[PDB]
Design a protein around this ligand. Structure first.
Ligand SMILES: [Mn+2]
Ligand SMILES: [Mn+2]
Ligand SMILES: [Mn+2]
Ligand SMILES: [Mn+2]
Lengths: 332, 331
């Protein structure tokens, strides 16, 4: 964590050297993007700098809308959020733009604001890709961190404490970590917990966080409809499916596969369900022993060791299942 | 600095006696076992002789999954002994460390506790009526998530040549997971500090998940109930089992708990037959709607957020009608 100290003070000099700070994450921002951004704006405010977060009404999905409702009703946080246009009008060549939770120009919330910026900072927890923000004054990329919220939280700890992180700000930063880690089950290191400690110390509300993230009744029902069918082999391979005649939401199929991993005896889950009139979807997950990337690549799809997917043209659910088992027996 | 003071005081007490006997509560859960394992690592860090009392009849199915892993590590497996062996090896200079409880009658083996001349108590519950007599040291903190969290703090101030192992860390961590329902309850910054320390010592999330796997049958029973839920505009939800199927009381309770995790639901009522002549209802609430009053109105009771009742002599449909009438009245 030598890096966090140096980066925190280097960041503060860059931000203070400019006339003000404009913060953006990726398009259709999730709670890590928004929590990280909130975090940076608190970073700016601890040093009495002027900071805004770019967000348009059309960027606000249902999860984020629950966060924003809370922000409107219970603090003064809303004043920091500004539209693209207001962002544009307000920028000068001395304005520092900080990009959080992405590093590809084409994924940035507003690429025009990005292109107008002479001064850029990038903070993200993925590894550098093909595209990358051009000519940044400072790059803070940590592939092994849980989330951008975690990275930003660490930077806060080095800054003056007079203008402290508020309860609601820390709650959104916390929610972002919860989402990116699947409640501390993925990409969670001791430093993730260090960040969780700092945030909870500043009032991060675990109950409110749960509230932002509740699924609805229909999703639970559709999902359990898939789970109910599960057949678990002795080797820990579980297959579940929807009727050939029922269309399922792709996310519901993914969730079903996720949830089967919480059940006794299941090492790897495969959920098979109609996605379109002429397309069958499969989502696969595993706890690391069985490689589902391999299974799905054998069926013309792909992904990663623990989570992959494929889609099959012009087959019935029963045919897809048979193709799937053929692949499994071959692989295992 | 209080934990620092407790850590060092406890070390002198343990090194003063001839050996250490560690004991949790009857029917130990993962926090009681995790804490006990932590106290045994505490002892080994100072090259002291420590055992954990555990009888085969004290090992429920969750704990068995854990003991299956511990069996793979003889160094750790050998620390676990029966009540008989503990009693037999105890002396006037043996220190007994009671973890995760403070009531004599709740301790795993009261006979061992009664034979003990030197006692230490580490727990995270509010002190009540009966209490361990004449403790040399007491570490009680009703705000902590768990005893594992408490013991982790003590470990931090001890020599590190003989560190907490990956498996030991994992069990302690799983204890915190169970007691906080995955950082959702009774969880403070210090809880996360403990998690950080355990994780730095290799605490394994995937193994923890293995310990806490849910049975498939029961997931399927629970969801049969949930599937039926009907949610009113006021956030009141009612779910039911069919009139001809008996559900286990614990499954009904879990279903009621699970409904509160769904959007728009302020209070849940789950109605399922529990016998040939008895209908059960578990009621739960986020804390706004009072289900104690509803249940009391139906000849039951409990608490504001969590209550229940049993209705003799009605079908599920009648129980539902009567429940709605109570709900209407309350409103
Ligand atoms: Mn993101
Ligand atoms: Mn992220
Ligand atoms: Mn306990
Ligand atoms: Mn406990």
């Amino acid at each position: 964590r030598v890096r966090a100290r140096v980066i925190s003070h280097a960041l503060k000099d860059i931000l203070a050297e400019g006339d003000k700070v404009i913060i953006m994450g990726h398009k259709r921002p999730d709670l890590d993007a928004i929590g990280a951004a909130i975090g940076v704006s608190r970073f700016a405010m601890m040093n009495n700098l002027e900071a805004y977060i770019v967000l348009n009404e059309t960027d606000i999905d249902p999860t984020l809308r629950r966060v924003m409702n809370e922000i409107d009703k219970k603090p003064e946080l809303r004043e920091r959020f500004i539209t693209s246009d207001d962002a544009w009008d307000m920028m000068t060549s001395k304005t520092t733009v900080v990009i959080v939770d992405t590093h590809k120009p084409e994924l940035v919330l507003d690429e025009n604001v990005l292109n107008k910026a002479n001064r850029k900072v990038v903070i993200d927890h993925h590894r550098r890709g093909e595209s990358f923000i051009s000519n940044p004054l400072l790059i803070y990329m940590e592939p092994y961190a849980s989330s951008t919220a975690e990275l930003v939280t660490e930077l806060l700890e080095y800054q003056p404490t007079e203008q402290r992180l508020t309860r609601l700000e820390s709650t959104v930063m916390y929610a972002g970590i919860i989402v990116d880690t699947r409640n501390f089950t993925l990409r969670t290191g001791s430093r993730t917990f260090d960040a969780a400690s700092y945030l909870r110390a500043h009032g991060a509300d675990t109950i409110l966080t749960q509230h932002f993230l509740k699924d609805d009744v229909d999703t639970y029902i559709n999902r359990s409809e898939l789970i109910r069918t599960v057949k678990v082999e002795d080797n820990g391979i579980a297959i579940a499916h929807g009727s050939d005649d029922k269309i399922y939401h792709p996310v519901t199929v993914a969730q079903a596969a996720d949830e089967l991993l919480s059940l006794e005896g299941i090492e790897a889950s495969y959920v098979v369900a109609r996605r379109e009139d002429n397309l069958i979807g499969i989502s696969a997950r595993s706890l690391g022993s069985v490689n589902v990337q391999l299974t799905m690549e054998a069926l013309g799809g792909g992904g990663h060791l623990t989570n992959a997917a494929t889609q099959l043209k012009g087959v019935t659910v029963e045919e897809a299942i048979a193709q799937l088992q053929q692949a499994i027996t071959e692989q295992l």
